[PDB]
Amino acid sequence: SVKSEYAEAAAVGQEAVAVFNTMKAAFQNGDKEAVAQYLARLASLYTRHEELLNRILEKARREGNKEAVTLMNEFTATFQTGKSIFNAMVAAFKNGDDDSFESYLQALEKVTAKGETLADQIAKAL
Numbered sequence: 001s002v003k004s005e006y007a008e009a010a011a012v013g014q015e016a017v018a019v020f021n022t023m024k025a026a027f028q029n030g031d032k033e034a035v036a037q038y039l040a041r042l043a044s045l046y047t048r049h050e051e052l053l054n055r056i057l058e059k060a061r062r063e064g065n066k067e068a069v070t071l072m073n074e075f076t077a078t079f080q081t082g083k084s085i086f087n088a089m090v091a092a093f094k095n096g097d098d099d100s101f102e103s104y105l106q107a108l109e110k111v112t113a114k115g116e117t118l119a120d121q122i123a124k125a126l
């Protein structure tokens with residue numbers, strides 16, 4: 001069901017949360033080799049999450065589930081804010097700009113924490 005596909009998508013989201021927090025620790029410790037690997041892992045995780053969310057939104061649309069579509073349009077928009085900030089963080093790492101990396105990292109945390117009430121609403125709506 002679309003609901004079970006959303007729970008599968010929620011787990012992937014949580015996998016990225018885990019890898020992100022490991023990555024933050026590595027950054028703070030200056031283990032740049034680890035950071036590079038974690039950033040690659042996050043890129044794959046976010047790409048997978050984005051795809052599952054799109055399939056869920058498209059299904060909710062085909063089902064005529066107007067409230068779920070509204071919530072998923074809002075949530076996917078916020079997901080893209082996170083994606084843009086993530087990509088900027090990756091660029092800051094490439095460039096050696098630790099000040100920008102730190103900035104983008106906190107911002108990505110706040111965008112993600114904000115979006116969690118909506119994430120829980122979607123589970124109930126599908």
Ligand SMILES: O=C(c1ccncc1)c1ccc(F)cc1
Nearest residue numbers: 013046078079082083086112115
């Ligand atoms: O911040 C992000 C994000 C980070 C990197 N690429 C895409 C989304 C995010 C990921 C999942 C989510 F549910 C809300 C936000």
